[PDB]
Amino acid sequence: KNNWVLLSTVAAVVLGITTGVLVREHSNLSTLEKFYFAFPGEILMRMLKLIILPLIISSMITGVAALDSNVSGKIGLRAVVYYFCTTLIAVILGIVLVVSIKPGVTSTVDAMLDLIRNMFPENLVQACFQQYKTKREEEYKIVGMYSDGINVLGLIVFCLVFGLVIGKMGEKGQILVDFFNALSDATMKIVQIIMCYMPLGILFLIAGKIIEVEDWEIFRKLGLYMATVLTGLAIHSIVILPLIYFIVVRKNPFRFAMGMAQALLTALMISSSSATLPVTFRCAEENNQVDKRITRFVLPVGATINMDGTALYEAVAAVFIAQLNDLDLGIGQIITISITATSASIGAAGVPQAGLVTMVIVLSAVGLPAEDVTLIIAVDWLLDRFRTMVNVLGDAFGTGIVEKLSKKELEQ
Ligand SMILES: CC(C)CCC[C@@H](C)[C@H]1CC[C@H]2[C@@H]3CC=C4C[C@@H](O)CC[C@]4(C)[C@H]3CC[C@]12C
Ligand SMILES: CC(C)CCC[C@@H](C)[C@H]1CC[C@H]2[C@@H]3CC=C4C[C@@H](O)CC[C@]4(C)[C@H]3CC[C@]12C
Ligand SMILES: Cc1ccccc1Nc1c(-c2ccco2)nc2c(Br)cccn12
């Protein structure tokens, strides 16, 4: 019905819980038998991990090269600055809520430097399956290591520089742009094939998790995770973003949101910001009367670099999974998670189920068990819909900001 992706995921979740409760109470499997029961779920995890490397590399180069076209002049610069500030506040807001609420609960300088080191790997081939970690030994020295763990930060940064370089090379770099455009297109087709197998893998992933839960405390922790994500998205969409619009534009932001209601409603159903653009353009220019020039240079940019939703959904999810693993975490470790979350999303911007694919990238890069994402998919459909609604609203408000900040340019 063109919504099989949503129906299949919910059906898999519902049947996964039904299978888990029945098997747990009507059977007593051993440790080895329980592992085999989740094997279809394990195979799904390998497919998602397998497609990470071509997805992020092809998409980041494709997106960055395409972004070079949209981001031109001062008008484009206003949107880039606007999306940096709103994303920055979302990153801080997400960390404050997950650290204070503490959903799944019960050196900082080294982590920060390791973050910069990973952004500049010493070998691109090794960056696909290894990450750099440092330690303090004893008067105290520093010892690097290099351990298994795809270096998403290094690959994304290089693709950023690579994408910008080829985009500016004109015709000499067109073959590289065409090559990675087709590779990106092919990878999305491959993920669609994996998405067809997802309902079977999700069924056994969730079902196996129900067999292994000793106490219902995990369900309570999942509820706090939903509250943390919903609370952060609500505050950003209701308080922070309208406040930013109000001060810069000195107009009522709530009226501005009414014109986008058609786009906001479409954002939930489709659950993709890029696919909602045609509706977003119509609402922004017709209902909000925003100049058509701004919407052309702002909305395409916002569909790529608007990470407010990721900073409030995927970053919070990664820290929540870390807290589930009894990791004490720190300022340096949380900042590493937050940057990884935004880097993963930009590399998986148009992938079906960005939320699932992005989280698997974040967990793999950070080091948390990629199988702990099972709890995320149980409500990912619900939270991903709200995440996209905030992203579209952020871009819609961004168009009003750039118009007010670039009135003189429009006159000229
Ligand atoms: C240190 C962290 C923030 C990453 C480093 C980011 C900065 C230093 C990097 C990221 C992408 C890079 C750009 C990539 C492509 C080009 C095109 C080239 O014709 C001139 C240099 C220029 C414009 C680079 C300048 C340096 C740059 C802006
Ligand atoms: C993903 C990790 C490494 C964080 C990097 C995030 C930020 C710093 C990166 C991600 C993609 C980048 C953009 C890629 C392409 C362009 C087009 C260019 O004409 C102006 C800069 C601009 C708009 C870049 C600004 C910096 C940017 C927004
Ligand atoms: C739009 C922009 C311009 C310049 C620098 C950063 C950004 N935007 C951004 C991203 C991002 C964009 C794509 C992938 O990640 N991540 C973060 C974080 Br964490 C914290 C703050 C901002 N951020």
From Swiss-Prot:
One of its GO terms (biological process) is motor neuron apoptotic process. It is found in: Cell membrane; Apical cell membrane; Synapse, Synaptosome; Early endosome membrane. Keywords: Amino-acid transport, Cell membrane, Chloride, Disease variant, Endosome, Glycoprotein, Membrane, Metal-binding, Phosphoprotein, Potassium, Schizophrenia, Sodium, Symport, Synapse, Synaptosome, Transmembrane, Transmembrane helix, Transport. Residues 24-46, 207-226, 321-333, 368-380 are extracellular. Sodium-dependent, high-affinity amino acid transporter that mediates the uptake of L-glutamate and also L-aspartate and D-aspartate. Can also transport L-cysteine. Functions as a symporter that transports one amino acid molecule together with two or three Na(+) ions and one proton, in parallel with the counter-transport of one K(+) ion. Mediates Cl(-) flux that is not coupled to amino acid transport; this avoids the accumulation of negative charges due to aspartate and Na(+) symport. Plays an important role in L-glutamate and L-aspartate reabsorption in renal tubuli. It is linked to Dicarboxylic aminoaciduria: An autosomal recessive disorder characterized by abnormal excretion of urinary glutamate and aspartate, resulting from the incomplete reabsorption of anionic amino acids from the glomerular filtrate in the kidney. It can be associated with intellectual disability. Schizophrenia 18: A complex, multifactorial psychotic disorder or group of disorders characterized by disturbances in the form and content of thought (e.g. delusions, hallucinations), in mood (e.g. inappropriate affect), in sense of self and relationship to the external world (e.g. loss of ego boundaries, withdrawal), and in behavior (e.g bizarre or apparently purposeless behavior). Although it affects emotions, it is distinguished from mood disorders in which such disturbances are primary. This is Excitatory amino acid transporter 3. It comes from Homo sapiens (Human).
